[PDB]
Design a protein around this ligand. Sequence first.
Ligand code: MN
Ligand code: MN
Length: 150
Amino acid sequence: MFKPHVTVACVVHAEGKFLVVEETINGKALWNQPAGHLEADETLVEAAARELWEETGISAQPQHFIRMHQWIAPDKTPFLRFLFAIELEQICPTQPHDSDIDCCRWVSAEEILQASNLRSPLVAESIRCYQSGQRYPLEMIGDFNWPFTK
Ligand SMILES: [Mn+2]
Ligand SMILES: [Mn+2]
């Protein structure tokens, strides 16, 4: 049965900047949203909150649903990437709990769109969706008669 990879990602915004994670991937440092795979017996939204925590060490629940992109990666690996928005009042400290993460930067929209080191083109598209003002309720992609405790 064809299954596809399912990932979650978060636009995090505060004081006019966005949070970005810097991973080194074979020798170069790239930027992504905080993003991750969805794991088993997990809610998308739950998954987004864990990947945020793991990649940045921020405790925050995703606040809205921006959009989902379905795309294929350069090596033909298929994705359903669920994108979310969180707003905070101010830039908050960060501390990744994942080894693969080198660091977090808080950066302007135009730095992300001009940047030549993005992990994929969805990283800038993401900022383009955010900026369109598109958001939705979390309930758009929510769970149904979930067996486990939230
Ligand atoms: Mn991760
Ligand atoms: Mn992960």
